[PDB]
Paper text:
Enteropathogenic *E. coli* (EPEC) O127:H6 encodes an additional, tripartite TA module, *hipBST*, for which the HipT toxin was shown to specifically target tryptophanyl-tRNA synthetase, TrpS. Surprisingly, the function as antitoxin has been taken over by the third protein, HipS, but the molecular details of how activity of HipT is controlled remain poorly understood. Here, we show that HipBST is markedly different from HipBA and that the unique HipS protein, which is homologous to the N-terminal subdomain of HipA, has evolved to function as antitoxin by breaking the kinase active site. We also show how auto-phosphorylation at two conserved sites in the kinase toxin serve to dually regulate binding of HipS and kinase activity.
To understand the molecular basis for the functional and structural differences, we determined the crystal structure of HipBST from enteropathogenic *E. coli* O127:H6 expressed with inactive HipT (D233Q) to 2.9 Å by molecular replacement using HipA_Ec_ as search model ([Fig fig2]). The refined structure (R=19.5% / R_free_=22.8%) has two copies of each of the three proteins in the asymmetric unit and is generally well-defined for HipB and HipT, while HipS appears to be more flexible. Analysis by the protein interaction server, PISA, suggests that the biological assembly is comprised of a dimer of HipBST heterotrimers, which are held together through dimerisation of HipB ([Fig fig2]). In this complex, the two HipB monomers interact strongly (interface area = 1,405 Å^2^) while the interface between HipB and HipT is relatively small (513 Å^2^). The biological relevance of the hetero-hexamer is supported by analytical gel filtration ([Fig figS2]) and small-angle X-ray scattering (SAXS, [Fig figS6]), the latter of which showed a major species with a total mass of 129 ± 8 kDa, in good agreement with the theoretical mass of 125.6 kDa. In the HipBST crystal structures, we find the Gly-rich loop of HipT forms a short α-helix and is in a conformation most similar to the ejected form of the HipA_Ec_ loop despite HipT not being phosphorylated ([Fig fig3]). In this conformation, Ser59, which is known to undergo autophosphorylation in HipT, forms interactions to several active site residues, including Asp210 and the Ser57 auto-phosphorylation site. We conclude that inside the HipBST complex, HipT in its non-phosphorylated state is maintained in an inactive conformation that does not support ATP binding. Near the Gly-rich loop, HipS Glu63 points directly into the HipT active site while Trp65 is wedged into a deep cavity formed by the HipT Gly-rich loop in its outward conformation. We conclude that Trp65 is essential for the ability of HipS to inhibit HipT, presumably either by increasing the affinity of HipS for HipT, or by preventing the Gly-rich loop from adopting the conformation required for ATP binding.
Author numbering:
A (entry chain B), F (entry chain E): 2 to 101
B (entry chain C): 2 to 339
C (entry chain A), D (entry chain D): 38 to 107
E (entry chain F): 2 to 338
Write the structure that this text describes.
């Protein structure tokens, strides 16, 4: 469905993938830096889930900011939960969501 | 009279400007900041339709991203250093509400980002409109990104209120939130006392919207995370339809998770949270009883600050009065303990 | 991130420094822990004569972990 | 090889275990350290009420190093 | 009637064999071991001519590398698991001396490799010749190599005796050596007592050739080193010239290095090392005075074991008579503080 | 006057050479394991000296074992790194001295 790069402090730490059964977040086997979230420890490396990992869902903005973005950009309200790619560069902290 | 940033009384010099130099310094770091923004509200804030109702008042609040170019505030669309919060169309004076509450939290010794009131450029000789501005905490002195993360995602909770089933019941509590926090930050008594006072003052001041995304983790000291500063503290007391929805955003004690059980204060003749309920909260975080007795006494003696800060704030007198019965009523309930 | 305790005095100065960097005063520690303020002052000077349980109690309140190696 | 002390009883149990693997009897520890045997049997089960200096002394005479982390 | 491995009495079932089942088990790990070698001395020990004259007794001892093939010993040329030390040609009965001493050391509780006396196959109906065998300590359970080092190399000392100056004086001492050891092994009291007793017992038993190449560091449990087991422990009392050469291999106290100062016992009427000199050694190691008193009392109680082990050994008597003379003498000196 | 290799636990640690002025021991740049002696820390890596390093000098035998090689071969102690090679496979510990 979709495949996107995940990067922390400007350097890519892993990749977020989406297929038919669900999503898969993956740390690059050569990354041994800090974990992007305490929900996603670096030691586990691979992260499967049918629904979007609660960390990634929570980086999307809501409220007035979700309304102004969705009145002009028609994304699939739920099936495409990757509204993060459109907002990837305006995320809180040191994390960026960038297309391949 | 009072400073639009610090709420402290202005001197003759700074009276006509409306801002003290000591407050302009706290906000910008320079004494010749211009807090009179060079753009109108309708210039950047689009008038969005009211989507449904009965949500959180913050779900209607616009947010603008600001940067400091010299002593001038400038609107950007990418990562900035400030967040500007106008009053929502349906809730006039909300920006003055956050400023009063946030200034109070700062005066009570909590970790609060620098903040204040700025004025929109007018259209034609009308009432000056003010908005709330605040420095982002995910920035350092050099303005370099500091990593952070909100609590709902950390605890892997898919809803900020913990309504994670179709009961509509809440399934995460402030007791459980604190237990999760000490598991991943440093459990010094200083951290626990600050956290316990954050929850008590959210209740005292009428902040029934301290949900899981108004808590944050900052990754400054390498791997060790620390609790983020206080942000998004507003008093809901002036707005009754929202104020009687909940006493707090989340259940207080883990025994109430999902509605399985009631807090002792609800079984008492007072029918709401009382002093006993917050003892059981602190007594679950490891705070010794003699310390909790002292912590309650310090909150009583801080009532001079709470009265003073709100009464000299820039809110409507009807709004200030609403907040001060909420404070005075709930502060009395702190006595019903043991 | 590990510091070898050379002497009992070395431990007291490390804890007292940690206490001051966190902003905790002696009266807060007395209420949380129950060790008197006069004994807490001795603990942070030279805890050679303080009950080991009192030293271990204070270290937990300050977020200090105590490990042993060889 | 690092082990975080959970309770004072934990430290007392490790030190007594260390002592036995070295083949050291209590009388030798009394002669070397000056700590009475009664106080040593005390330390090796729960050193909660034992002076910190003695626990630190017994750890050294047994080759155990004390560390602190955060 | 005494065991050629343990020096304990044999039990009728073992008397004719000459080796107890307990001893054969301890040496080989199997109870079906053949202590009667299948080769003669001259088959593998080729005596070289002249040798030297000023060398220490250890420098004349041959060394054969042995391995255990189905309960039978076989001489290998490189890397064995056992070492066979026959008596040197000029020092008959030395193997029985090393066996007697190292058995005593083992009985006193020191860390000693398993050892014993094996016999060569006869050549022509002569009395059987017995040699000293010992298991190598730089091997583990599966016979895999374990790293080790001698102290002369670790301390960067160019001479076994520390004769590293522009004169004939010694510049390393037992005190200086013990301070080096605690700096690099685990400083626990049990180690300090053992090392102190090794030094006192080398003096008591007449081993005046415990030099820096007779101390070792074993790198077994990770990077942390341990003191190597006792080895090369022979009593030089039966050989008067070699014995009257030195009281020990190294000076006892650090103050003695370079001949700068004398040990306190040298100024006394006894003119040799006495108990106060060994107290000062222990003090420098960090041993409490109350402990050293008890440590000395234990050593007095152990003369029963010292008399017994040597008396039931396989040395020549006039040699046994010599050792007990030196021992009783120096054990008497321990009382003088 | 050879460049001889040292072997600890079966893996090459480095090599010991004899030049014109003196000797030089070189822990291989990729080695980050245990050191063959406490006199020779891994951290220093390079080890020059006028005379034979006190460690390797002590690794050579001295008694009846040395007089055997001094009887057949007998180079009169002219090659200091070149007496270890006669028994490089007869050393105590896990150390080996092997040419090239």
């Amino acid at each position: 469905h979709r495949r996107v790069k995940v990067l922390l402090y400007g350097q890519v730490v892993g990749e977020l993938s989406q297929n038919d059964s669900g999503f898969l977040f993956q740390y690059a086997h050569d990354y041994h830096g800090p974990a992007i979230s305490i929900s996603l420890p670096v030691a586990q490396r691979q992260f499967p889930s049918e629904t979007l990992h609660p960390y990634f869902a929570s980086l999307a903005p809501e409220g007035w900011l979700r309304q102004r973005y969705s009145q002009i950009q028609h994304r699939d309200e739920n099936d495409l939960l990757g509204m993060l790619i459109d907002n990837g560069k305006n995320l809180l902290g040191a994390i960026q969501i960038l297309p391949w | 009279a009072n400073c639009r940033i610090l709420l402290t009384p202005l001197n003759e010099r700074d009276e006509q400007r409306g801002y003290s130099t000591q407050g302009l310094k706290r906000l910008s770091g320079t004494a010749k900041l211009n807090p009179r923004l060079g753009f109108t509200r309708t210039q950047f804030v689009q008038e969005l339709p009211r989507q449904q109702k009965g949500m959180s008042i913050s779900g209607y609040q616009p947010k603008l991203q600001l940067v400091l170019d010299e002593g001038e505030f400038r609107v950007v669309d990418h990562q900035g250093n400030f967040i500007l919060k106008p009053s929502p169309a349906d809730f006039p004076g909300l920006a003055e509400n956050e400023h009063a509450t946030m200034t109070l939290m700062s005066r009570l010794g909590f970790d609060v980002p620098v903040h204040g009131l700025l004025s929109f450029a007018p259209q034609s000789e009308e009432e000056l409109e003010y908005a709330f501005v605040i420095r982002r905490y995910d920035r350092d002195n050099k303005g370099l990104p500091v990593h952070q993360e909100q609590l709902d995602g950390a605890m892997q909770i898919t809803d900020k209120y913990g309504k994670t089933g179709n009961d509509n019941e809440q399934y995460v509590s402030y007791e459980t939130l604190a237990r999760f926090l000490v598991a991943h930050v440093n459990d010094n008594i200083a951290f626990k006392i600050d956290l316990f006072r954050r929850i008590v003052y959210a209740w005292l001041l009428g902040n029934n919207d301290m949900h899981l995304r108004n808590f944050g983790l900052v990754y400054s000291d390498g791997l060790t995370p620390a609790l983020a500063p206080v942000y998004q503290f507003v008093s809901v007391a002036p707005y009754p339809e929202y104020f009687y929805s909940n006493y707090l955003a989340l259940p207080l004690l883990t025994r109430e998770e999902g509605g399985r059980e009631l807090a002792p204060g609800f079984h008492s003749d007072y029918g709401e949270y009382i002093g006993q309920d917050f003892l059981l909260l602190g007594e679950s975080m490891g705070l010794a009883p003699r310390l909790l007795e002292k912590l309650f006494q310090d909150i009583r003696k801080e009532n001079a600050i709470v009265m003073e800060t709100y009464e000299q704030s820039f809110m409507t007198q009807d709004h200030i009065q609403a907040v001060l019965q909420c404070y005075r009523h709930r502060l009395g309930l702190l006595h019903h303990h043991h | 991130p590990l510091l070898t305790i050379e002497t009992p005095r070395h431990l007291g100065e490390q804890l007292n420094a940690r206490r001051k960097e966190l902003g905790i005063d002696l009266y807060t520690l007395e209420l949380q822990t129950g060790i008197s303020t006069s004994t807490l002052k001795r603990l942070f000077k030279d805890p050679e004569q303080v009950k080991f349980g009192s030293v271990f109690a204070v270290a937990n309140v300050l977020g200090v972990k105590l490990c042993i190696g060889e």
